Amino acid sequence: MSDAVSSDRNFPNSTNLPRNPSMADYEARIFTFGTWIYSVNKEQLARAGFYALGEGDKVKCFHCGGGLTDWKPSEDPWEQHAKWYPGCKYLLEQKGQEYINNIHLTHSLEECLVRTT
């Protein structure tokens, strides 16, 4: 439970000292991936604050302080990340909440299979 789930942060400090653009640079990110993961990752991640941790094609945010490994279809890091959590510093700094809001939510469905649409 830690120092009171309510008097702590519902977790052992998720943000592991993020906001480290010094090493999260452009060539720093791509460099991590050692040109192995999918294509279009250069601008994709470099712009969304995603860098390679060491898994096979997986990714995580180094500027926001959160992970987003591959466990679903191709799903561009842009869409996948925004759904993972809108409270990601850099992530928002790029396409603002207007985008993340459009992503996380949906185009109109938001019914899950159909429900009542």
Which residues carry a binding-site annotation? 61, 64, 81, 88
**Would residue 19 be called left, alpha or beta, if left means φ above 0 and alpha means ψ between -120 and 50 degrees?**
left
Binding site membership for Zn(2+): which residues?
A: 61, 64, 81, 88
Residue 77 lies near Zn ion (rule: CB under 5 A): no
Select 3 or 11, whichever has its Cβ closest to Zn ion. 11
Residue 48 lies near Zn ion (rule: CB under 5 A): no
Residue 61 lies near Zn ion (rule: CB under 5 A): yes
- Count of Cβ atoms closer than 10 Å to residue 71 Cβ: 8
CA distance 94 to 47: 7
CA distance 62 to 81: 12
Select 9 or 111, whichever has its Cβ closest to Zn ion. 9
Residue 18 lies near Zn ion (rule: CB under 5 A): no
- For residue 114, give both structure tokens: 């159909």
Which residues of the chain form contacts with Zn ion (CB under 5 A)? 61, 64, 66, 88, 91
